[PDB]
Paper text:
[name] is a member of a large family of proteins called the [name] (ATPase Associated with diverse cellular Activities) proteins. Six [name] subunits rotate and translocate progressively to form a hexameric spiral assembly.
Δ40-ATAD1E193Q formed oligomers as assessed by size exclusion chromatography. 3D classification of the particles resulted in two distinct hexameric structures. In the second structure, the subunits are arranged in a similar fashion as the first, with the exception of M6, which is in transition to convert into M1 as part of the [name] protein functional ATPase cycle and now bridges M1 and M5, closing the hexameric ring (96,577 particles analyzed). This structure closely resembles the ‘closed state’ structure observed in Msp1. Refinement of this structure yielded a map with an average resolution of 3.2 Å with most of the side chain densities clearly visible, which allowed us to build an atomic model. To initiate the subunit translocation, the M6 subunit loses its bound nucleotide, and translocates upward to bridge the gap with M1. While examining the interactions of the mobile subunit (M6) in the closed conformation, we noticed that it is held in place by contacts on both sides: on the side of M5, substantial contacts exist between the large and the small subdomains of the two subunits.
Residue numbers in the entry:
A (entry chain D): 43 to 317, 328 to 351
B (entry chain C): 44 to 317, 328 to 351
C (entry chain B): 55 to 199, 210 to 317, 328 to 351
D (entry chain E): 43 to 318, 328 to 351
E (entry chain F): 69 to 317, 328 to 347
F (entry chain A): 86 to 161, 169 to 197, 208 to 317, 328 to 347
The structure:
Amino acid sequence: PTRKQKVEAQKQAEKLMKQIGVKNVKLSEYEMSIAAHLVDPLNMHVTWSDIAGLDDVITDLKDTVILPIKKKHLFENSRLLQPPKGVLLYGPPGCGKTLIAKATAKEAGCRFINLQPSTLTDKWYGESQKLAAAVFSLAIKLQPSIIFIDQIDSFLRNRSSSDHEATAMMKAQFMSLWDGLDTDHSCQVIVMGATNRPQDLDSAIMRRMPTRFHINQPALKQREAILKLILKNENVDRHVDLLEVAQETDGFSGSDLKEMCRDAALLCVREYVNSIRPVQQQDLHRAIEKMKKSKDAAF
Amino acid sequence: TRKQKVEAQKQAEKLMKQIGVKNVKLSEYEMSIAAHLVDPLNMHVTWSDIAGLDDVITDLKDTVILPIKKKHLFENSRLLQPPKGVLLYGPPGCGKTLIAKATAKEAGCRFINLQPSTLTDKWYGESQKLAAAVFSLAIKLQPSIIFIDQIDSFLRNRSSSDHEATAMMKAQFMSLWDGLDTDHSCQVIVMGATNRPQDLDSAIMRRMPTRFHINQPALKQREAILKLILKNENVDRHVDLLEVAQETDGFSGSDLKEMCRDAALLCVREYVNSIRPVQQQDLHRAIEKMKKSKDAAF
Amino acid sequence: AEKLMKQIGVKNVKLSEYEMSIAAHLVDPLNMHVTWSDIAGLDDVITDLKDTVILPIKKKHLFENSRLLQPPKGVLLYGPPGCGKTLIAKATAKEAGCRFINLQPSTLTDKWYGESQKLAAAVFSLAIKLQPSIIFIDQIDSFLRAMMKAQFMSLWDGLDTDHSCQVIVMGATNRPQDLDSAIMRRMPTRFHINQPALKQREAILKLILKNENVDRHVDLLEVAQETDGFSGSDLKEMCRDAALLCVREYVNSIRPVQQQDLHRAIEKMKKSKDAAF
Amino acid sequence: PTRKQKVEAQKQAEKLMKQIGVKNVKLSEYEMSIAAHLVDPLNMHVTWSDIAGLDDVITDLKDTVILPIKKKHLFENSRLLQPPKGVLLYGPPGCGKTLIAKATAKEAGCRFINLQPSTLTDKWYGESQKLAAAVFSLAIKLQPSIIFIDQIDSFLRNRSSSDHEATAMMKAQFMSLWDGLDTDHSCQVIVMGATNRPQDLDSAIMRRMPTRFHINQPALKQREAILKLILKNENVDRHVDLLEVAQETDGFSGSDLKEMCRDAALLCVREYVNSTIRPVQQQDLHRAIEKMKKSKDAAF
Amino acid sequence: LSEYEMSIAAHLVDPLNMHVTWSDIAGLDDVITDLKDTVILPIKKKHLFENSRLLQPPKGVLLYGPPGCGKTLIAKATAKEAGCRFINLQPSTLTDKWYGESQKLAAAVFSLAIKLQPSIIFIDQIDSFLRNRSSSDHEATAMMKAQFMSLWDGLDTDHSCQVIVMGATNRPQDLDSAIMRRMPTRFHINQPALKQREAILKLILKNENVDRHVDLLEVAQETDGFSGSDLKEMCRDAALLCVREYVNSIRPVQQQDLHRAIEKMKKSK
Amino acid sequence: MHVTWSDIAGLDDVITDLKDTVILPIKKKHLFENSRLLQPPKGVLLYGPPGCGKTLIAKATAKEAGCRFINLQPSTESQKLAAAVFSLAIKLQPSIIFIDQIDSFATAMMKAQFMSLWDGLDTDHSCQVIVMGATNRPQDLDSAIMRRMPTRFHINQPALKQREAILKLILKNENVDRHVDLLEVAQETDGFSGSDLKEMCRDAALLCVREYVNSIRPVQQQDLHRAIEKMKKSK
Ligand SMILES: Nc1ncnc2c1ncn2[C@@H]1O[C@H](COP(=O)(O)OP(=O)(O)OP(=O)(O)O)[C@@H](O)[C@H]1O
Ligand SMILES: Nc1ncnc2c1ncn2[C@@H]1O[C@H](COP(=O)(O)OP(=O)(O)OP(=O)(O)O)[C@@H](O)[C@H]1O
Ligand SMILES: Nc1ncnc2c1ncn2[C@@H]1O[C@H](COP(=O)(O)OP(=O)(O)OP(=O)(O)O)[C@@H](O)[C@H]1O
Ligand SMILES: Nc1ncnc2c1ncn2[C@@H]1O[C@H](COP(=O)(O)OP(=O)(O)OP(=O)(O)O)[C@@H](O)[C@H]1O
Ligand SMILES: Nc1ncnc2c1ncn2[C@@H]1O[C@H](COP(=O)(O)OP(=O)(O)OP(=O)(O)O)[C@@H](O)[C@H]1O
Ligand SMILES: [Mg+2]
Ligand SMILES: [Mg+2]
Ligand SMILES: [Mg+2]
Ligand SMILES: [Mg+2]
């Protein structure tokens, strides 16, 4: 027939499945096309120790998502002790969202799966809803599993009249398979999504993601912590305190400080090549000044 | 060729043996539609598990379940038959899917989930055949309850920016609902749960006249659901569910479940660091956490 | 063909395969318990439809030679959703004297090669073979908003000129504004099936409860003056809910429906009608 | 379906890929349709020497983008020394932006690719997101590469509610594939964009383009530099005071001085042809400046 | 030769059947002088100074002023005296009721213009098409009006193609800030102002009927106050009055019919 | 075309404007061929309300001026057929090419060839090949050749007196009552459209016929009033 571009998902999500260690899974063409976006747990290079600035959020996520997956002998006796069916990572953009997502993909346990909603929308009629169903079918087939939807503020957007029929049907099927009729059993299928704009997400999807973790912008202590974490392996001058830098920033996020340290290292490398030099804490001041002058362009 | 119905024919047979049908001869499309039949014994929720509202439950039981049984009493009257549509509308969360499961389990006749994703097909002239086979199967076994979850997305408001197959299916649904051959003594009822009935339709809205408003829980309903949830789990003796219900004032039927789950998780976390009941102190902390987290939209 | 010949009453069956497949689709006037007495409230529209379409079919001796009385090709019954359209169509299918046939465009779209123009030609060949015939396409808005569409349009425009076959295309419509630009013009006769007014509401309410054991002091005029916006199906649902509420006092352990049950049903229906707002 | 539009670019992207130097790259239909917009390195005829007026920006770009591409032995040990994942060239319209982009399309090494967001949007449903994914797929397939998004203040605009679902999905997928779950690894895939309205670009795309270069309106020294650069190939007299016209303009951008020089040359050719090669004697420049000022005044 | 290219080719005016020269445009003569040496001279005789990098015709010619009085007449005459392939489509031929069918249309237009020799492009009423960029407007034409700028002078442009785009507007104050940049040579088509009116009146009355002696200087200040296009429509009223009077009983014109046409045009206002 | 200019009543001023402008081609030489600006417009268009004598106006303009007419039939390779039709219409001079439903009518190459042929004909001859086939709704009909149709007239409801004249001209064909007058019916029609009076008279005749079929007589004022009331209720 037509649309036979699934001739390489089954040959692409099989060698990728052997890297995870699944023995006997009987899937269809749509299920394999969905599983073609599974992430390898060993392909990540960031653990919980690489995420600084916030500590209570890490422990909360670990005891809400990671803990109920293991120690099943203690959480299966009670009626309501299973992990939630949704984790909404909201807050300002930059620090925390994708890093916590990678930490959950690597060190959390059960098979992680990225959705990438671009593969759900198809050209042919009656093909996007089948893929949306195969998503949850594969999630149920692989217990447990964590369905990750990055930028969930666009795919599962607020419903209105100016929406395509296939996208609206997929958005309805998502909430009809989340906690629908034949769902809500002991399946350990959790759906998480990181988004910087949770104001216009939805009204029916917002309740299906009850555990909402606010990853705020780093404060003074958080900025000091992330500045001390970033300048750990690279050569830095012996007496360089990260408190004055974090106090001087006062508006930098977790990604702007990374750029500031990268700019300082690049300035040191350029000064060395013009003629291995450590950051004498003087380049940090001019880097902060240049970054502030650049950020002042939005106003 | 679309020769996958074979597997849909090997999944709509064993399930049939789980329901107890003896002689029902169907076609390929009818079998593919019946492949979504729900097992009544697979549900684990009855009318006793739905608290907070009682008049709505009694109304639904006397409107849907009561006409199904005692057919000798309603066979003489002309307008004493079950309706052809039940629209469960209201705010999202509490009541809709729970009442759907209760009607699937403890209501009687064979329940069927539509799952409109299977109606839309890639091949031309295949979605309308499945839409017809839906009602064909519904009439084939009487009675039956056709459930369409989130019906405000499949039978949307008819406009010009709609595909030919979807528009044809939406027209065939209302043509086979109360058209030229239906509306006889068939006892085929179609129900649907939705949280946005404002933009559902103009012709489908009248075909579902029995509309049950599953409102958002009030003080009494909040206390009722809080007492129902905290029933089997261990809790302190002097814990008044009225206090937390009056303090909340802003949760639906699903947010209180999350609050109780968070309280139990806090208890089991404080225990696992070194079985502890909730002393009504973790309840307030979970309520404050959920109230400070629900401000993400604003 | 022969499987459904029991009602056409003509031994002129020379149908082919497509004609045979289309012949299994005409309506069954036997199991149609609807006449002009069943439809209430709108009697002027009924008599208009009658003296416009019906006598051109039954009266076949006065106009026989050439006379101007002709069945208008294309009758569009348009209005709000409910209250009359399919009921009038079914009454016509019952007692129009002609072979009524339903379309249901879902059967036209064949999967093989996407060729659905052959069926669009076969349906018209069948309608002309056993004239008079009324081709009814329910929900004609979604069906006509594309080789089959042009072929069917040209067929309907070209074959209905010899005034030898009384084939008439009739359609019901709840959204007449977005129907079409040429189809709306192609149908000369348009019947506006309005929603029941203060008098039509009372008429249909009195017609709904006739054989039931209703109380003596139940003035339907008060119910009509209390509804103020109820459609045809809404009043039937209200009466059904009132009957269920009256029988609820007996099933829990035959009671005549009083005014209190009707008032409670009206209040419940008016509260429920605010779902779309 | 739409396999025709994707069967022509396939016969066009291959030839353009033959002269670039990609040896073995296996692409799909969407990847080939995206690669069909690759720019030829030899077609660009503007280098760093042809861009005057700004000097610190040039060396900053050479150290930030051009330097980490080569000499990989120095930036392979540390954790954060790779080239950035975005270069936002913001400033008033005129000088710098498109010229710097054209210069980097030739004198940067790695394969340059223009996005041309007009080809991303498609008529069929579920086709624009596939092309947006194929963009980054092709970028990762050949390393390194520079994805240029001209006038990025329109495609990756500020997210709101009055936007189409396809453009919103594409805008979300761009930032999801920029620094998402499987793209933070070292891949040398850099995305740059030139725009004249950075105030309403975005809140999540702005952080993904940390290196923000401001191309200001030419000042006195910059105006003198560009006026001396432009009046180098054309025939001019011996003595030309470039500071005079530079101080006279006081409001001309990098493109208005080019127009003034063109108008002076056209006046010279008109005076020559009217009789039947004449060098500008620093008098047609003042008249052209006055005419350009009168034209800019009468525009309102 | 794509599909959108062939769809655009339906608006490509043939360079042979134009029959519009500088003689048809009377009245204003200063704008014609500055446009001949700036647009026609660099386009033609390219074998003289092709070595120079900035001796090419400007790609941003724009003619503003009141509506009418020779706006597109100068464009057609220029394109006829220029190389070939006058290309005007519409102010609203684009913006089809689809998704991704408006920017691709402009892309096809520009590709077709690049395919052949300069092929002067004329965009009638660029004021509303390329209006000032903002964030409150519908976010479907802003991306299009930005792609137009990105394709006008971008990466692949600035070659020896001579592709010159010509615009037209009635109020170039809210047009743009980056589009006016690539439009450096902007001519000012003014109002006739008591002289060009008489000139165009003497021009139009040349190839016509008998037209007995009536000095155009007489009806020069008591004529239509503006809109020379209505002066083109004013002589039409005299012609219809001269051809509609003889049916009651070819007739030569005089001051009476012209004055009555003037009074009728004034009453129309 | 069997239509007559005197039969179609209504806007008498528009009729004279047509019989002057469009029939300047019917006028001999030295009147429209001598002056360059006195020639009639090339490619006249017609737009306005739906129906109301859309094709009837073109038929009357072709019959009164005696100009040759030919049906374009846009519903019935395409570019070649269009070029052949244009050549056939331009050969037999003078001739008018009338099209049906031009508002919704390779097609682009055919339109470009037709526009080029019309431009060449106008540059060669004054009014040899005319084109009058534009339908209603010309605001967004098409954008193929805008300069081809620069002349048009908004044919709408002229006035109540024109409606009364049309009713008197259309009703004076069958048997009518003495007291029943078309002016008395138009005084109560309250601004009915052009095609509305014909359908109202048809409904009155159908009522008068049904009066005998239910039990032939001439139409009366009561039947006309009932038909007008039914048309207003159905309007
Ligand atoms: N706690 C942290 N420890 C180390 N690095 C951090 C931390 N927080 C942020 N970062 C830096 O931020 C970058 C990741 O940003 P990320 O991808 O999470 O943005 P995002 O929040 O996903 O963007 P958006 O809000 O648009 O989705 C990494 O390069 C990392 O160096
Ligand atoms: N009366 C009740 N008794 C017990 N639990 C309840 C009650 N009402 C709601 N719940 C809780 O709500 C959850 C079910 O939510 P449900 O699936 O009905 O949401 P929904 O209304 O279907 O959402 P949407 O409106 O988006 O379709 C269950 O987990 C259940 O614990
Ligand atoms: N005049 C009437 N008298 C009695 N019952 C009526 C009348 N009109 C409508 N009904 C009731 O309405 C129901 C039929 O609805 P109806 O056929 O009018 O809907 P419809 O207009 O065909 O729907 P759609 O607009 O989708 O075609 C019947 O069950 C009948 O009981
Ligand atoms: N430093 C320079 N050296 C030489 N030429 C220059 C310089 N700066 C600007 N120019 C001139 O400017 C023109 C390029 O303008 P460009 O396309 O960069 O405008 P832009 O800023 O991209 O416009 P927009 O902001 O609308 O995208 C070239 O023709 C070039 O001659
Ligand atoms: N000075 C003039 N000399 C000769 N003809 C003129 C003159 N001014 C106007 N006309 C005539 O008036 C007509 C319309 O004038 P013009 O082309 O200036 O309008 P326009 O502003 O281009 O209209 P639009 O804005 O719709 O494009 C032309 O056909 C032209 O023949
Ligand atoms: Mg992210
Ligand atoms: Mg639900
Ligand atoms: Mg109906
Ligand atoms: Mg630019």
